[PDB]
Structure formats: structure tokens, C-alpha cells
Design a protein around this ligand. Sequence first.
Ligand SMILES: NC(=O)c1ccc[n+]([C@@H]2O[C@H](COP(=O)([O-])OP(=O)(O)OC[C@H]3O[C@@H](n4cnc5c(N)ncnc54)[C@H](OP(=O)(O)O)[C@@H]3O)[C@@H](O)[C@H]2O)c1
Ligand SMILES: NC(=O)[C@@H]1C[C@@]2(NC(=O)NC2=O)c2cc(F)ccc2O1
Length: 316
Amino acid sequence: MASRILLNNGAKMPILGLGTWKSPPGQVTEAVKVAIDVGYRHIDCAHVYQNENEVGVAIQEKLREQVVKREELFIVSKLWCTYHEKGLVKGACQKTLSDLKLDYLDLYLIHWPTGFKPGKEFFPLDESGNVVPSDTNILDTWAAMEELVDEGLVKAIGISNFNHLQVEMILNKPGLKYKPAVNQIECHPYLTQEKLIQYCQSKGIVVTAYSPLGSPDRPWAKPEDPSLLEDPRIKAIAAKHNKTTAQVLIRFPMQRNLVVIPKSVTPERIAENFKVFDFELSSQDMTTLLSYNRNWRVCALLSCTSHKDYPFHEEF
Ligand SMILES: NC(=O)c1ccc[n+]([C@@H]2O[C@H](COP(=O)([O-])OP(=O)(O)OC[C@H]3O[C@@H](n4cnc5c(N)ncnc54)[C@H](OP(=O)(O)O)[C@@H]3O)[C@@H](O)[C@H]2O)c1
Ligand SMILES: NC(=O)[C@@H]1C[C@@]2(NC(=O)NC2=O)c2cc(F)ccc2O1
């Protein structure tokens, strides 16, 4: 299968990208350089990751070296929760553009549906430890995202961590100008997301699967938690196909018509993770992997469960 998926803005998005959350700033420049050298054409970024300057150094060097042309890259970033105010969206986008050393983004996402009080802190707290919300809703933030398209700063806009009712809310927005192109959500064999994926795809919204390997480097990992990479059933499917477990975990969402964004800063794994276009999981393999769902989340935004727009109380 094909390397890119067509978005509802008419542009094509590479189905494999490199994730950068937790990629240390002293390692991510080489990670992105290696990724581009071995074929990656999509990098998933965010201001909250604090490493966009270093990602940008790599992008700029590979453009300067003429390893790739800008039109061949698909660079994604995300608007942090403390910038949901309509007067802050442009500046947030522009800071990301300046750090990534880009004149446009291919895709800019609302990182979470939850808006927080603006300020220096990414998670502003009250004296009791609750995250302080913003009163700006998802629809006014969306209008501000639409303006970025109309100013040439971004080619596509989308959402991330939106539940089905929140997707619907955008789709039903009075005066909607641009539909979301993408909803980026956690998705892997333990969180298969069957209901939300079907909804989004039925509406022409492409889904990107994050944490496809189960984010073994997440900072809140516990010994007892389920581990995709170590799951012998998944290992068995990998062995049958003469591939690694990670390669199965990456190919899985691809065959669901998803985009997938595994993260690594290890050169060998960056290359490994890209060598997924030369085998096929059977339908039986796909059904089997889907059967491992247990509604287990890496990213539950646990500090924000009272926020009015917290996404994960809703079944989907
Ligand atoms: N929109 C959102 O809210 C959101 C949330 C979470 C994630 N994301 C995006 O999705 C990306 C991927 O998710 P993630 O970073 O949570 O986790 P992930 O991609 O599921 O897993 C990354 C971890 O797996 C390791 N790894 C990578 N390839 C491997 C391989 N072939 N064999 C063994 N281990 C391997 C990495 O180690 P090394 O790096 O040490 O090689 C790292 O510890 C993020 O980086 C970010 O770009 C977005
Ligand atoms: N939630 C986050 O995005 C960061 C990630 C991380 N920060 C980072 O650079 N790598 C990481 O895993 C981190 C590391 C920690 F030890 C504790 C919290 C924490 O939170």
C-alpha cells in the first residue's frame, strides 16, 4: 500500500510519521535528520514538547542539503491548551513556525479540547491543584484555527483528543468554514478506538494513531501496566511475519486506514519503524489484534478530569 492518504483539504499526508514527544532536545535533531535520511516525510511536533527548535534545526539542514524539498515534507504541530483564546492562536502558531524554521505548517491541531488559563505555565494550577480552565469553547478556538488557513500559515487544521460528541460539535458549528482534516487520538491494540474511528472516517476526517507502541517511555509508566511490545500474542504475529513486534504495531493502524506516528530517538529503531511497507497482516491478524482491546490509555490527562471539556468521560 500507498504511502500517503488524501485529506479533505485536497492535500496528501504520509501515513507514517516520526513522533517527537519526550525526544530529548540533545537527541531529536539527529533523530529527525536520520528519519528524513531513511525516508520519513512526516514529523509530528508540538509546542508543549519544548523541542521544536531542535526539530526545526534538522528540518532546515535537510532542506538546505536538498535531501528533501519543502513540498515533500508534512510537518504537524499543535496548539497548546493555554492558547485557546482567539487573540493568542496566531502567535502560538507563529512561535511554532519560527521554532520549526517554517513558513507554513502542513497541519495544525488543537492539542486537546480543554482550554486553560493563559500564562507561562502549561498546566496553570489553583492553590488546591486543579488546572484553571479558560472560558473560551471549542468553537471559537476552531474559528481562530480557520483564520490560520486563510492567512497562509497552515495548509490544514484539525483536532486531537476530541471525543465523538466534540468532533460532532465542530462539524455542527454554525458557519463552519473548514472541517477538521484530522483527529489525532491514542490508538493501539489495547485501545482500539473502534467507535470513534468509524465516526471520524464516515465524516471524511482522517485519524492519526498516537502512542502506537504503547509509549513505554511515558513518565507515569508502572511495572504492572500492560506492555504491547512484550505481549507474546503480538510477538507471535510478528514472528510469523518475520518482523519485529514494533513493526506489527505500526502496520496495524496502517491497515485500518490510519496515519501512525511512532516515536524514537534511536537511529536503528527509526529505520526499523519505517520498514513496514513490505508485508501485510491478514484479516485474521487484524481481527486478532483488535480483540486485544481493553480501553487502556497512555494519555488520560488525569489532572483535568473536572474540566468541562475533558474528553474521556464519554464512552467515545
Ligand atoms: N496528540 C497527543 O495528545 C499525543 C499524545 C501522545 C503522543 N503523541 C504523538 O505520538 C507520538 C508517539 O507516541 P509516544 O511517544 O507516546 O509513544 P510510542 O511511539 O508508542 O512509543 C515510543 C517509545 O517506544 C520506543 N520504541 C520506538 N521504536 C521502538 C522499536 N522499534 N522497538 C522498541 N522500542 C521502540 C521508544 O524508545 P526510543 O525513543 O528510546 O528508541 C520510546 O520509548 C509522540 O511522540 C507524539 O508525537 C501525541
Ligand atoms: N508529561 C510530559 O509531557 C512530561 C514528559 C517528560 N519530560 C521529558 O522531557 N520527558 C518526559 O518523559 C517527563 C519526565 C518526567 F520525569 C516527569 C514528567 C514528565 O512529563
